[PDB]
């Protein structure tokens, strides 16, 4: 048995910053992987990352890479995304949630709506000027 929590979400103006995380309680994390999902309006929606609870092939957005820090912990089995000077194209929902696993090269095969445990809980970015 695990339990999920959401914390830090909330809308923040162009030039600002902006903290999100998701923790897990119980120590069977390893079989449990977390994605993350955004929600463009107008368009479809895509993948963000991709968490392994095994600390192993993981997968993350390059686009932003130095520009944002993102840490990760196997021993607590918490995730913490920092973002700063927010633009228009940030302007999403962006969603985590946590399906049982084994191993992936995609979240793909384990993004059933049966396999999630948890999901919803959305923060949306409300961007301006």
């Known amino acids: 048995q695990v339990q999920l929590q959401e914390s830090g979400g909330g809308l923040v103006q162009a030039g600002g910053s902006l903290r999100l995380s998701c923790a897990a309680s119980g120590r069977t994390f390893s079989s449990y992987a977390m994605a993350w999902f955004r929600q463009a309006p107008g368009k479809e929606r895509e993948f963000v990352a991709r968490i392994s609870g095994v600390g192993t092939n993981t997968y993350y957005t390059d686009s932003v890479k130095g520009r944002v820090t993102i840490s990760r912990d196997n021993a607590k089995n918490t995730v913490y995304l920092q973002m700063n000077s927010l633009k228009p194209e940030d302007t999403a929902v962006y969603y985590c949630?946590?399906?049982?696993?084994?191993?992936?090269?995609?979240?793909?095969?384990?993004?059933?709506?049966?396999?999630?445990?948890?999901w919803g809980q959305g923060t949306q970015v409300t961007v301006s000027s």
């Open positions: 949630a946590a399906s049982i696993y084994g191993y992936y090269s995609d979240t793909s095969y384990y993004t059933r709506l049966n396999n999630y445990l948890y």
